[PDB]
């Protein structure tokens, strides 16, 4: 084997500006080589070499440039890109943003060092998601369902209970069961969460007793802004190792993706890169791809990576660059409405903008019922007509609702009342909920229904 | 009859017209400041980089 | 050693500073102009100088400090007045005599020649001590005893302990050796503003911030070590709430922090605090300044000092919490701080973000706000303090859409929402119940039920009544009070009584200047229980309204009672009134 | 053979297209028809999943050959294409039964693949279709998310510090996009017999 070499330690640091540390007289640099910077005080922090030109090197330190002296700090070039020591033993533990074990436990004994930002899967070898998931919440499963390998985020403005919904989903996560070793292992990324939210996550996960199959990658808002960018990379790399290289299906969760967007914006503004819309970097689409575009099923392996991000519209606007690019990339949306929260509904899922682009394959005959697609389409389409009827009633009066419009208004009322609402710990099965969905569709006459054929639901029978 | 007509007009103005205009004002503000102002700084920043 | 080379406005380039460190404060020129290092390109440095740089001379000396922007803590920190960059305004004025702030003042933050009474703990001359150990306490003044904590990042076996007596900060009150080398510590601790203070464990907040106002105490409670937000731009509500916090809040200390507001406004507030006086629960009369510290940086002050004032204040609050005291910070105008940050960013030509603020504004605001919380102390003996921030916001025109407002609402747990409409309608509390909220109620429910298990149910019923108040409002608006049912009329009347009797305070009146939580709880019980007892009887609304005149008067007076009688007497009176109202509602049914 | 990917394939003489593109969709072929040789463009804002129309058109067009060259698109769409095109089938006038995968090629690179390859994807797609046209067929393509090949442009213009024209895109964006789109059209090919193949560019532009 090629003989090893001890990393060269330099002291030629010849410039500091912003978060970027300049070096000179570097002997044979390497792009994206991880360099750990030791200050004169002796404290150490990591960093990446962003731009390599000639014998120079423009390093981006992690813990901040503060305290770096141009004649007393030393930089050591490890000569290798960032690598996360993934291992099967990493399950049931908590790690910092960069991966420091923070559960008062010994560090990870790596089964293999794996580089973050792993290469893409050859789409010829890529396959298609073909199985539903039993998260434990009615409205997500019944309409705009989630497939074992499908990516889909949660759109929810600030202050909404989306964190509680994520915690409930993670604690109640399970297969359809229509096995425990390959059962759902949950990788729980936490980008830029509050300390109270962090303690809540830790306590809730420890309480459900599923610590044996859940990994927390916590990154608080106190941690450096650049260190938040590598947290999703590490989480997804560990998920890739667990799923493809070990077998068990992984249900990747990342909270506050808007925090990741803000971290990207801060890092880009630091280096003065070309800005896209709203001052975000012009390559944000590619970065959000490299984060999201890993969920899927690989042909030769029995693993599967399901992605459930959690975004937050900053101004409660769907047109914001982060949610817009996500919706471009994320293959569907599960939407949460503040207006429904104003009505004191615990799971404020609004179904009008919520669609799963892979639902057309999750449904079928192996699972669910043969009337799933048509019933979902009707409860998706008649809601818009009910909203239009409500608007007409608001702008004209109660007399505007004719013998047909009043039916749509009553449909909307009952749909928002009974169907959407669910218990904080209710595992409402599909058929029991689909019966009430059929009742809601049957509030309207069985002949005015245009899109659905009568025979489709007629195959199913009440009681 | 007159009260019904006036109430219809008032409700239409409150619901449709004002809520139509205000998003238009927000979009116009975003298009100017969010793009033109950002571009102007970026253009000048690139020019200063060229000079340096 | 070190000479300037290029002076382009605020920006300054100084050669011969190879050993300089990033963000290390430096003294520039003979006038001792103070500025922070930004870029260390080459063997040269780059400094932005806070005060005006007009009149600098090339090759004028530059003197390093080997320390970032730091604050000298210790005895004498309370009471005084300090600038943004930790400059004692009072002593500067006394020493210079004139009024203007000299360009290049060098007065130390705390007088190092003044004497304070010192006495050590029972520690021995050869014992072992570590960082955060409380080895002595000092009577800086009466009733504000100051503990002397051994500085963090310092530990070792005890070598020398100063016996009790009269001493000054320049004296070496403590000396100890970890290794064979020995270090001697004085009573002055320096700590960078940017670096937070070391903590042992971030506890869960479990005690409400009793502000003395019923609306904040019961409707939208705030917990010790919890963030708070105020949309304060007019109506003097910010002044009112600040005075309430200074006088009646549970906090053992208050650290007001004013940045970039109107100079005359800061003059008014800094003349108001000395006039403010608070009585002790033991019957003693004190001055709020004896427990108050004030950091005021007006608009005329340098922009960098305006940005650093907030961090200075939060570091002072953390130092106070280091000895387990409960201390409350009050950021006067976070909007002004954000504008100062924007000006600094424009000076640095950083790439603009949303609405012109730099992209790190939200991140820096979150980093600042994350320092609040109930925290276990570092080092023994065991004790626990808290730091709560009640930093206000000034949205432009009241539109809660500016990035400062959005970030603050995203980070702050409890938002109280002062409304100018209530101020126009002559509302002393001015708290809009329709927009305020308290996200910490779920965590505070433990204490809420421990004090009274029915109090939380009463609060939920009051929230439901407030929610139905607007419903009845448009009901009256569209058809009038005639269409209201007897139960609906009773609910509307009870909501109006709650709004005009308990949800509103009288402040200026001696009887309603301070509202104890006991009186608040009894008033809430006497209101909600009466509301229900009248509700289930549906009885003609007119008949019960006529026959409950005495009950209505009792409910109204349930807040007119002064706190002079104390909790045992007022609680008994409120209980008797509630029993009488219940008897009148039940017997007449 | 071999051919430079930026130099268009030579022809005898381009000529007007006068045969409609039978997409099999009511809206596409009834109100807003497209001709066999013309250029189309579908905005399909976020959430619309415009690639469903793309796949339907590729499945059911009268075009002899389809080159789905989706650039910057999600990999699951390519998995769907590779899974369904063989199992899906079409019939020819001879009466036999055959799959559509026998005539469809994918030059697609996903979004997680390196950025700079996207322009190469687009150009290789158009050159392959040009070759199939010179064969004489009525070949067609549809480049999913051509707007991704504007992010590819600006993420390079930024490294070169070229002068930003509009929203960060370089000045030549319109020029290059025209140089790409202007390669469609019915044309009498070079040499006998008198092949008259065409090529269709059904682009997709995703706006922010």
Curated annotation (Swiss-Prot), chain C:
Enzyme Commission identifier(s): 7.1.2.2
Residue sites binding ATP per the record: 232-239
Enzyme class: translocase
Molecular function per GO: ATP binding; ATP hydrolysis activity; proton-transporting ATPase activity, rotational mechanism
Signal peptide range: none
Key words of the record: ATP-binding, Hydrogen ion transport, Ion transport, Nucleotide-binding, Translocase, Transport
Keyword RNA-binding listed: no
PROSITE patterns reported in the protein's UniProt record: ATPASE_ALPHA_BETA
Pfam short name (any one): ATP-synt_ab
GO-annotated cellular components: plant-type vacuole; proton-transporting V-type ATPase, V1 domain
Catalytic activity line of the entry: ATP + H2O + 4 H(+)(in) = ADP + phosphate + 5 H(+)(out)
Disulfide-bond pairs as recorded: none
Gene Ontology biological-process entries: ATP metabolic process
Purpose: Catalytic subunit of the peripheral V1 complex of vacuolar ATPase. V-ATPase vacuolar ATPase is responsible for acidifying a variety of intracellular compartments in eukaryotic cells.
PANTHER family named among the record's database cross-references: H(+)-TRANSPORTING TWO-SECTOR ATPASE, V-TYPE PROTON ATPASE CATALYTIC SUBUNIT A
Assembly description: V-ATPase is a heteromultimeric enzyme composed of a peripheral catalytic V1 complex (main components: subunits A, B, C, D, E, and F) attached to an integral membrane V0 proton pore complex (main component: the proteolipid protein).
Name assigned to this protein: V-type proton ATPase catalytic subunit A
The species this protein was found in: Citrus unshiu
């Amino acid at each position: 084997e090629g003989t090893l070499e001890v990393a060269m330690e330099y002291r030629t640091v010849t410039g500091v500006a912003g978060p970027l540390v300049i070096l000179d007289k570097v002997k044979g640099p390497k792009y994206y080589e991880i360099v750990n910077i030791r200050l004169g005080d002796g404290t150490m922090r990591r960093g990446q070499v962003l731009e390599v030109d000639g014998e120079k090197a423009v390093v981006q330190v992690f813990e901040g440039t503060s305290g770096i002296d141009n004649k007393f700090t030393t930089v050591q070039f490890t000569g290798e890109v960032l690598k996360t020591p993934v291992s099967l033993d990493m399950l049931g533990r908590i790690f910092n943003g960069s991966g420091k074990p923070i559960d008062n436990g010994p560090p990870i004994l790596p089964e293999a060092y794996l580089d973050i930002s792993g290469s893409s899967i050859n789409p010829s070898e890529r396959t298609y998601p073909e199985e539903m998931i039993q998260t434990g919440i009615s409205t997500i499963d019944v309409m705009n369902s989630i497939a074992r390998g499908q990516k889909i985020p949660l759109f929810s403005a600030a202050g909404l209970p989306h964190n509680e919904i994520a915690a409930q989903i993670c604690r109640q996560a399970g297969l359809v069961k229509r096995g425990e070793e390959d059962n759902f292992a949950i990788v729980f990324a936490a980008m830029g969460v509050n300390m109270e939210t962090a303690q809540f996550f830790k306590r809730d996960f420890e309480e459900n007793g599923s610590m044996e199959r859940v990994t927390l990658f916590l990154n608080l808002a106190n941690d450096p802004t650049i260190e938040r960018i590598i947290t999703p990379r590490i989480a997804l790399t560990t998920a890739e190792y667990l799923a493809y290289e070990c077998g068990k299906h992984v249900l990747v969760i990342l909270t506050d993706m808007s925090s990741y967007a803000d971290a990207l914006r801060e890092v880009s503004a630091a280096r003065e890169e070309v800005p896209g819309r709203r001052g975000y970097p012009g390559y944000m689409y590619t970065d959000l791809a490299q984060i999201y575009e890993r969920a899927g099923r690989i042909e030769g392996r029995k693993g599967s990576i399901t992605q459930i991000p959690i975004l937050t519209m900053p101004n409660d606007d769907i047109t914001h660059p982060t949610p817009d690019l996500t919706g471009y990339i994320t293959e569907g949306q599960i939407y949460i409405d503040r207006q429904l929260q104003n009505r004191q509904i615990y799971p404020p899922i609004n179904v009008l903008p919520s669609l799963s682009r892979l639902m057309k394959s999750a449904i079928g005959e192996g699972m669910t019922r043969r009337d799933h697609s048509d019933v979902s389409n009707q409860l998706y389409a008649n809601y818009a007509i009910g909203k239009d009827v409500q608007a007409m009633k608001a702008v004209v009066g109660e007399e505007a609702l004719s013998s047909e419009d009043l039916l749509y208004l009553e449909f909307l009322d009952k749909f928002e009342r009974k169907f959407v609402a669910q218990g904080a710990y209710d595992s409402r099965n599909i058929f029991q909920s689909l019966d009430l969905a059929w009742t809601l569709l049957r509030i309207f006459p069985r002949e005015l229904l245009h899109r659905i054929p009568g025979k489709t639901l007629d195959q199913y029978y009440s009681r | 009859l007159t009260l019904d007509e006036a109430i219809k007009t008032t409700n239409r103005r409150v619901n449709a017209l004002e809520n139509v205009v205000k998003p238009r004002l927000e979009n116009t503000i975003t298009y100017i400041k969010g793009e033109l102002d950002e571009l102007e700084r970026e253009d000048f920043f690139r020019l200063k980089k060229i000079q340096g | 050693y070190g000479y300037v080379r290029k002076v382009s406005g605020p920006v300054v380039i100084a050669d011969g500073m190879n050993g300089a460190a990033m963000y290390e404060l430096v003294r520039v020129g003979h006038d001792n102009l103070i500025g922070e290092i930004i870029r260390l390109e080459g063997d040269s440095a780059t400094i932005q100088v806070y005060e005006e740089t007009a009149g600098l001379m090339v090759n004028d000396p530059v003197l390093r400090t080997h320390k970032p922007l730091s604050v000298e803590l210790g005895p004498g920190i309370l009471g005084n007045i300090f600038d943004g960059i930790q400059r004692p305004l009072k002593t500067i004025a006394i020493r210079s005599g004139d009024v203007y702030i000299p360009r290049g003042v060098s007065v130390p933050a705390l007088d190092k020649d003044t004497l304070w009474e010192f006495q050590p703990k029972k520690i021995g001359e050869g014992d072992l001590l570590t960082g955060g150990d409380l080895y002595a306490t000092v009577f800086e003044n009466s009733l504000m005893q100051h503990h002397v904590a051994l500085p963090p990042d310092a530990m070792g076996k005890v070598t020398y302990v100063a016996p009790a007596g009269q001493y000054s900060l320049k004296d070496t009150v403590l000396e100890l050796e970890f290794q064979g080398v020995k270090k001697s510590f004085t009573m002055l601790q320096a700590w960078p503003v940017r670096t937070p203070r070391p903590v042992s464990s971030k506890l869960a907040a479990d005690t409400p911030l009793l502000t003395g106002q019923r609306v904040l105490d019961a409707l939208f409670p705030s917990v010790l070590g919890g963030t708070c937000a105020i949309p304060g731009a007019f109506g003097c509500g910010k002044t009112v709430i600040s005075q309430a916090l200074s006088k009646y809040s549970n906090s053992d200390t208050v650290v007001y922090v004013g940045c970039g507001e109107r100079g005359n406004e800061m003059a008014e507030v800094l003349m108001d605090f000395p006039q403010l006086t608070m009585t002790l629960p033991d019957g003693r009369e004190e001055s709020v300044m004896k427990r108050t510290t004030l950091v005021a940086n007006t608009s005329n002050m340098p922009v960098a000092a305006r940005e650093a004032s907030i961090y200075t204040g939060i570091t002072i609050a953390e130092y106070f919490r280091d000895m387990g005291y409960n201390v409350s910070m009050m950021a006067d105008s976070t909007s002004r701080w954000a504008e100062a940050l924007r000006e600094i960013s424009g000076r640095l030509a950083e790439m603009p973000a949303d609405s012109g603020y730099p992209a790190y504004l939200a991140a820096r605001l979150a980093s600042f706000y994350e320092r609040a919380g109930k925290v276990k102390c570092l080092g023994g003996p065991e004790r626990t303090g808290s730091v709560t921030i009640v930093g206000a916001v000034s949205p432009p025109g009241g539109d809660f859409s500016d990035p400062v407002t959005s970030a603050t609402l995203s980070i702050v747990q409890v938002f109280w929402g002062l409304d100018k409409k209530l101020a126009q309608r002559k509302h002393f509390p001015s708290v809009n119940w329709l927009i305020s909220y308290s996200k910490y109620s779920t965590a505070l429910e433990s204490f809420y039920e421990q004090f009274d298990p029915d109090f939380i149910n009463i609060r939920t019923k009051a929230r439901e009544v407030l929610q139905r108040e607007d419903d009845l409002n448009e009901i009256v608006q569209l058809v009038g009070k005639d269409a209201l049912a007897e139960g609906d009329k009773i609910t509307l009347e009870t909501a109006k009584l709650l709004r005009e009797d308990y949800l509103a305070q009288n402040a200026f009146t001696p009887y309603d200047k301070f509202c104890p939580f006991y009186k608040s709880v009894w008033m809430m019980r006497n209101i909600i229980h009466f509301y229900n007892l009248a509700n289930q009887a549906v009885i003609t609304y007119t008949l019960i309204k006529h026959r409950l005149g005495d009950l209505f008067y009792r409910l109204v007076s349930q807040k007119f009672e002064d706190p002079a009688e104390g909790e045992p007497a007022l609680v008994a009176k409120f209980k008797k009134l509630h029993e009488d109202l219940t008897a009148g509602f039940r017997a007449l049914e």
